[PDB]
Symmetry: D5
Subunit: 156 residues, 10 copies
């Protein structure tokens, strides 16, 4: 794939259309991703404009959602990424993940440099997943795993 986008609104408008079709069809993201061979987090992100689907998966999810050919093509384009409307989320569900950075951002930095050294944990050589687990005290918990490669910063 060598084609890419520069205006996020094209793929985000498509996402809204995908979401309406998905709601009318009573589909989950797990079943849309089923049969693609790709993780639900990756396929979902693509539908929402933040990843590119390979051609086979794009044709599969496009059939499930009754997308036209322009939209199946658009899902294969490399996106202009950035899902937050204006830098800080307003939605409570998304905001909590921003708050985690306001509370633990410097701890994440400190512990990364302690365990690995100078450098970063990659957001590119990176996967995440969301799992539901029972809480022993009652209710349910989400275990969200962020898995990134350490890239060192070295003198030159």
């Amino acid at each position: 794939m060598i084609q890419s986008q520069i205006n996020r609104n094209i793929r985000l408008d498509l996402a809204d259309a995908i979401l309406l079709s998905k709601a009318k069809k009573d589909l989950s993201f797990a079943e849309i991703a089923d049969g693609t061979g790709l993780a639900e987090a990756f396929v979902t992100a693509a539908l929402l404009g933040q990843q590119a689907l390979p051609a086979d998966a794009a044709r599969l999810v496009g059939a499930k959602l009754d997308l036209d050919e322009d939209s199946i093509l658009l899902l294969q384009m490399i996106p202009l990424r950035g899902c937050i409307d204006d830098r800080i989320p307003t939605d409570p569900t998304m905001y909590r993940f921003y708050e985690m950075l306001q509370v633990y951002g410097t701890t994440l930095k400190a512990l990364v440099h302690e365990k690995f050294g100078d450098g970063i944990i990659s957001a590119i050589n990176f996967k995440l997943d969301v799992k539901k687990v029972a809480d022993p005290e009652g209710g349910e918990r989400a275990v969200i795993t962020l898995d990134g490669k350490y890239l060192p910063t070295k003198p030159f």
Copy 2:
């Protein structure tokens, strides 16, 4: 503890002093937290102004870092939380965790509502840890686990 702060600069100035003492003594966050009974991410966050230490832990880390009495008291106060200077990190290491929200924030929302329903994953009933693992392809990876309680949103 019923005492709380309203100006983050007091605890953040203390954090700078702690970091200098820690560097002079060639100490790690893992060994500072050793013997407290508390997770390294929680103790580290407290040193950096983002949590309150119980009194015994405050006195233990205060002894290791040679802190004065006002500093040991300050570590026990409930903080005015918020570690980011101006909303969006400039530091590359911290920025990558913000970028994961720009790429996956709406996917986290969508999968949370799919698996749990309306509501949030708590940032309060919440634990974080950082683990170093070998990358089977060569090098090292960080596995960062966000573990939060699901709190539902229902009608009233």
Copy 3:
């Protein structure tokens, strides 16, 4: 309900259409909510894009307001919440509630930590209501009750 929105403009555009229909039919929010079994604050918030209606209530209010089937479905989706145009309200009526935060925000923090401890008053395990009472000195007062569960911040 496992379906959710990612762009607030879809439901906010619907809210504008709902308000136009409501005005043309000379309807109040109290009477739109009548028969749903749900509090006026919750139903009103859903019409305005900030909550999800259960199917029976969505069909009821949709019939009252002569909404099409796509709109009745949209009212059932979990929203991308955030009603303020650009972070701080310009509207005087909305602004007064922001000003209460500018004046009393640190007092709310201080008294919450005093009475409950470290942690938060939840905005999720939460309900709100608005009551009109007579002012003994003449005129009318609004008594707005914010009712949220205390969630503690504990060491781990």
Copy 4:
């Protein structure tokens, strides 16, 4: 009182000093306000730079907190109000009250105009209180009461 402030940092610096004295003396805001004849929310707000104390109350809290004479005078000055560092709180405890506006701000406007009419609920002819109650399902809740006069907007 005819004296007023124009730079919030003077009273906010005093607030930090008050908080340190309060912590060293193991005092609560309820204890400090006891004997003033004034509500704990009002006295706490004054200590935190957001209200002016009458002379007798300033002298009483100054004795309780071992404050010097310049500080006792400053507490009587009409403040430059505004407790939030930079418009939107970073602290989770304070942020939840901002989130309540992001979710319910337009609902509050709508219901105020329906029950009262055009105009505002005053933030000046206004009282706030924080009450701890039992959660009937287990735990504790905060009931926060915002009590403001309705001021109508009428043609002229």
Copy 5:
């Protein structure tokens, strides 16, 4: 009137339409307000989306401007107020009134507290007018009168 708006763009678009019709008909705001019994500043503000007209006045100005029935209805709705595009005006004529706040804002605060005490001059129990007077030195001046009730901030 119990109907209210939440998106200012609806009434601001109507304002643009009103201004075109007004220009084609060579009408002044004084002429438009004539016969309503309402002040030119109030009627003008309503046309520009910042006040609600009573029904009789809305029908009168609507006939003068040849507005359709939905527009005459819209003029009667309680607006989402805020006329400035993005917080600080760019237009020189409007900017000068913002500059008077940058130069005299703290003087207004100081003199209000000196003459009245703690509290505010209301922007709700409030009237405004613009008058043209000859300058004794040559030319013309505007005398703009801001007339607001003092609302005290008292202890409770």
Copy 6:
């Protein structure tokens, strides 16, 4: 006077010191400006960093407030004007004058162009004053007069 400032903090720090001396001496702004030949709004603005006092007035108010020689000199310098901390006031008393602009800013523009033509009402050839009067319906009101020259915008 040909000397001017470029950093507002110098004159604003002096204002804080002036306000402290004024509070200790139980002085009003009206009495500080008495004997000066200048309006209370002008002298007050100078004390608060927003105007320059002529030498005679600077010596008079400096004696009343027991200011040192450097301070009396500073009051005579042309200031770097701008009294609002960060563009939009947080203080309720100051904020109401900003809200008047959010509600009536476009009406002021429209009526200025109607009565005078294209151009501005000067914020430079400009005086203001604050008068306390009875509210005929009970209470007190402020009448604030903004008196500015019309400067036309003409083709060239």
Copy 7:
């Protein structure tokens, strides 16, 4: 002219249409302003939404550009001025004039107060001219003349 605009987008949309017509017709701004009796900077600013044309000039440029009657009337309206999209230009050509202010803004203030006294150089009683000259070292230079009335700030 007593008619004015409150939303810059109306005249800025017209400016885009004017620019398209001008490009199709291979016209320059100098050619369009020729015969109006008005300076090229003034006429150009009017086409671009920042000035109002007298009726005769509006009809003339309307004929040259084949504009419709609504557009000819719009050009005569007093504009809602402000040509910069979001406060600071992104365009390099436009940005250089902003940088001139970042480098020389305080020097301009200092030298105006030295040569004239307290007050301003008017942006209203003001003319602007762009002249192309030879660079004696090779190439070309622009000599841009800002010609504004000094308005004094005097005590009252």
Copy 8:
């Protein structure tokens, strides 16, 4: 000169000290620049932190203003330029020059491209000067000349 600054506050603090010394000595910027062989706009800008003085001029002005050796050295350093506190000036005298950009910014772009072509008028190969002239209609005017080289944007 190969030495440069990265934090504008160092040279801006020096500028404040220079302005105090200049005020105490009753010196003008014209007086200070006399004998340097450099334009008053250039020398003034250097004093205010926005240019570098050659060693001989730095020693000359430093003797006139009684500067210590560290300050005379600092004046020769290449600055971190940017004189506006926070992007848009609050001071009326400087604001008017920003306002001329808001009114004429797109006209400057348009006429530059018409007379010269694609590219910029340089802010580096650039000089400005301020001249006082009599107004034929009474009073005084400033003629501010911006003189910059055209640098073309060419295909490659």
Copy 9:
């Protein structure tokens, strides 16, 4: 070329249409620029709204992409430059180039002043190119060359 744009959305909307046509036709930017005699970075930038194509090149790329005549003309207009939506990129690929400025911006300044002197490296007399090379350890690297004229800052 003397025709220029003032609203970037026109050329950016055209860029979106170009990108769709390009994707449908399976074309690369290298292929589109082939035969123009112009560098791929210059032609690509023009397609994306940030440069002006000479007429022959606009017609060549217009034929390849099947653009209409209005679009071929638009590509020849001098643009209103600025490709970033809101000042700081959200897209990871674009963001890394901003991060290089956050890490090395002051180093670039310091080394430019050391090697060249006071002044700038031009962004106008300027070429860039992107080269794909082998990483000598495994993988691929991009070598991005910024080539700009040094423009000195000297006294006048």
Copy 10:
């Protein structure tokens, strides 16, 4: 090195002290880096707070600059990176590199995806250098080479 900073002001204050010492000693960055075996861009960045020096280089440069032992230790700390005061540079020399992103940012994205695929050019596995070359048309040019590893974004 496992020690890291969380507040950039510590190292940026040290940078200012370094720059003064460097100026007094008439040292270049090339001279300071000579003998370290490290690139001038890397050592300079470390002095300016944006990289960490190894102990041997920190001891060497600290001796050259007469730094105390706390400072030599601080230079070895992993920094809180981010050299721009407030997101967009004000300094012309730094601003030009930001302008290159405003003009070419989307072209860099487009050509990276064309040549390499989805993913990024790393800012971590990354080197930079500045070279001076003669301009054949007269004068000098800077060739700034950005050299980063391509990291792919792949499905998972």
